[PDB]
């Protein structure tokens, strides 16, 4: 149930939509028709306190996730069905130093099809939807991208390598120090596209840029 | 195949249309209105007419539930236009157009007809076509992004696009650049030496 923090924190956990959906009208004071095929299984969590608004917001996050929308039907509002793993777990997570649009395009490679990603401003929050394994790793990648500096980056795609092979190799030759003026640059892949995003401030982003391109040799 | 060119139609005509066309058959919630206007000169298959009913009903706030072997329509100037692109595979442009589309419009990619459909005033959507021409080629588009501090994106990318047009910009010439105004961010892209050119210039223009 969503615990007061007007603003409230939620832990749920296995309970059945309609569940949930329910809760959300306590909350709200809103009320919804459910279309009977509305169904499943969710987890919902949220350390960071959530106003009101909020709590909409990830209740849309929700039903989205699931294939639901919700629709005006004789008076009433109306949940129905819109035209992946059995469970799924929605977190809200709360970025400190960072504005969350701009680390949205960097962590979206990691969010399978079957997920979810939105961004509630209001808490510079971003709301994810996955298996919770999946999430821990994403909120660890997202701890640590919030904590640079800049969020600049170039996109290459790759004609002839292999986009993890080419990740492996710049990752190792910064590693070893072997990368000459691109220390401080980052790379992210990103496979659906096979294609690298390259992070950093200025200098060293063009200096790692360059470098990726090598790679990508005929 | 079809084409369309349906001007201040009621969504009910449209609707009507569309039935003709698919085979479909739509009950309509007594609260649906408004006036539509829908424009495809490129031929679209019937499975491709159908996309474009989705993003149509999608732009005035309209959603379709299936209920059985018919469809409900219920509530969840702008025009709706099919562009096709030539060399470009649509899914990639669809992210770099997306900025350019205000939040009251819509973006969709027809990836089997290589179309993107759009909504918005008649008068931006012209202005998204004429970019799109400039984007559209057949090796993939790499490119840099700016999230500006001091500047502001519409301005920079006016600055951006003078200096390149007049002869100021020495070295950049061939250079595109796209302004994200919910963002404040600039796309920039082209071949490698102008883009990495365009890329110093913004930059320049970001500090104070
Ligand atoms: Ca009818």
Same mark, same amino acid.
């Given at each position: 149930?969503?615990?007061?923090? !007007? ?7 296995? !309970? ?39 709590? /909409?917001?990830?209740? &849309? ?42 680390? +949205? ?29 999946? +999430? !821990? ?15 600049? /980056? ?5 004609? /002839? ?8 190799? &710049? ?48």
């Amino acid at each position: 149930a969503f615990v007061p923090a !007007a603003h409230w924190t939620i832990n749920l956990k296995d !309970a059945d939509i309609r569940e949930f959906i329910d809760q959300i009208s306590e909350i709200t004071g809103e009320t919804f028709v459910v279309d009977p095929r509305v169904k499943g299984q969710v987890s919902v969590v949220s350390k960071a306190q959530l106003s009101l608004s909020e709590v /909409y917001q990830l209740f &849309l996050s929700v039903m989205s996730t699931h294939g639901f929308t919700v629709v005006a039907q004789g008076d009433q509002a109306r949940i129905v069905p819109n035209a992946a793993p059995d469970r799924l777990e929605t977190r809200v997570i709360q970025v400190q130093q960072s504005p969350v649009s701009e680390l +949205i395009p960097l962590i979206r490679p990691l969010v399978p099809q079957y997920g979810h990603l939105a961004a509630v401003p209001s808490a510079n929050a971003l709301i994810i939807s996955d298996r919770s394994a999946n +999430i !821990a790793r994403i909120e660890d990648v997202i701890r640590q991208l919030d904590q640079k500096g800049s969020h600049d /980056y170039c996109v290459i795609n790759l004609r /002839y390598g292999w986009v993890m092979d080419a990740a492996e190799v &710049l990752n190792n030759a910064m590693s070893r120090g072997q990368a000459k003026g691109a220390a401080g640059a980052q790379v992210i892949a990103d496979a659906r596209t096979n294609r690298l995003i390259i992070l950093g401030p200025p200098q060293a982003r063009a200096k790692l840029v360059q470098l990726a391109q090598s790679l990508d040799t005929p």
